């Protein structure tokens, strides 16, 4: 069996950041879904977080995705920070309510207000995909994969999105890549 093992339920956005990593790097995993947080083994390493998780795929996995320079890792860097920090608590909120909750149990008036939370925390994204490409900047790397994995839930939910264009032509870009269609376009269940 392969030295790489992740846990973890393929339709979590964490578990898809880390699925997705692996798949962009190539490697040999196995993914084990039980019957959320994923999980990382390898060697005998052993890690609990998300992001954690991703920039050392890349790091150990694929240089092409862990930018080597300080200054330019940390444009996606902060991506990865604010993603978390920011962004998921609101936007785990929203999709409860929508495809997790019966109607009988909805907040509504809670519900609204995490779409329109989620929705202008994301325009700030859309402002920063207006000037480069990537959130990692001129080239696709680490630093846009956790916000990547959970936009594929904003676009895919059946909700009512403001206009963001930018963020979406980026979305557009992400959905080529094949390790992005088996790592984070799974069930959006
Ligand atoms: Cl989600
Ligand atoms: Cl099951
Ligand atoms: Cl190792
Ligand atoms: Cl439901
Ligand atoms: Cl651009
Ligand atoms: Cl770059
Ligand atoms: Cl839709
Ligand atoms: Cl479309
Ligand atoms: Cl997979
Ligand atoms: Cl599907």
């Not at 093992?5 to 692996?22: D, F, M, P, Q, Y």
């Not at 879904?33 to 996995?61: C, F, K, M």
């Not at 509504?108 to 480069?132: K, V, Y």
């Not at 959970?150 to 895919?156: H, L, N, P, V």
Request: charged letters at 20%.
């Amino acid at each position: 069996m392969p030295a790489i093992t992740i846990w973890g339920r393929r339709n979590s956005s964490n578990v898809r950041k880390a699925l997705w990593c692996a798949e962009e790097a190539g490697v040999a995993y196995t993914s084990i879904e039980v019957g959320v947080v994923p999980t990382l083994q390898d060697g005998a390493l052993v890690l609990w977080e998300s992001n954690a998780i991703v920039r050392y795929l890349a790091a150990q996995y694929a240089p092409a995705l862990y930018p080597q320079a300080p200054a330019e890792r940390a444009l996606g860097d902060r991506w990865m920070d604010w993603t978390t920090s920011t962004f998921a608590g609101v936007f785990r909120d929203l999709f409860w309510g929508v495809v997790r909750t019966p109607e009988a149990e909805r907040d509504h008036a809670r519900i609204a207000a995490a779409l329109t939370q989620s929705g202008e925390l994301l325009a700030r994204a859309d402002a920063a995909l207006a000037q480069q490409p990537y959130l990692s900047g001129g080239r696709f790397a680490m630093g846009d994969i956790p916000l990547g994995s959970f936009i594929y839930a904003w676009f895919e939910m059946p909700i009512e999105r403001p206009e963001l264009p930018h963020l979406q032509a980026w979305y557009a870009r992400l959905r080529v890549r094949p390790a992005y269609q088996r790592g984070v376009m799974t069930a959006l269940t």
